[PDB]
């Protein structure tokens, strides 16, 4: 149907916007602490602690498969990256501190992204 095509065009445009957002958020992780899944070889007990692991590479896979239907779903995954890290790692670690900085700097990006998704529809 034409409606389905129209829908798919919207999803494609959302994906385009979210790809820009993801690039901007990952730029706020210059240490690449969140670039890849936490290694279950280097941290064999990780899944005993964290029930829903997330990282930028995994988000990017879902993104390019057009797997985010709305901004909320994308934000859920971004928040997992930060929240998982702030539980597994103590306050006095470069890991926890990187998550705080990513959350703080990311807020600006996500604030405008929400306005853009709304405005453009
Ligand atoms: C994102 C995150 O939580 N990283 C913690 C961590 C993973 C692997 C090795 C060390 Cl030393 C630390």
Helix content bin: 55-70%
DSSP strand tally: 0
CATH class: Mainly Alpha
The class by helix and strand makeup works out as mainly alpha
* Shape, principal axes of CA atoms: globular
Major sheet details: none
What CATH architecture would you give? Answer: Up-down Bundle
Terminal CA distance = 21 Å
Protein name: Bromodomain-containing protein 1
Cross-link (Glycyl lysine isopeptide (Lys-Gly) (interchain with G-Cter in SUMO2)): 41
Subcellular location: Nucleus; Chromosome
Domain Bromo: 9-113
Can you characterise this structure?
The chain has one domain: Bromodomain-like (Histone Acetyltransferase, Chain A, Up-down Bundle). The protein is built from five helices and no strands. It has helices spanning 2-27, 46-49, 56-64, 71-88, 94-120. Helix 1 packs antiparallel against helix 3. It is globular and about 50 Å long. The protein binds N-[(3-chlorophenyl)methyl]acetamide (8U4). N-[(3-chlorophenyl)methyl]acetamide is lined by residues 33-34, 38, 42-43, 85, 88-89, 95. It is classed as gene regulation. Keywords: PanDDA, SGC - Diamond I04-1 fragment screening, bromodomain, epigenetics, XChemExplorer, gene regulation. It forms a monomeric assembly. PanDDA analysis group deposition -- Crystal Structure of BRD1 in complex with N10931a.
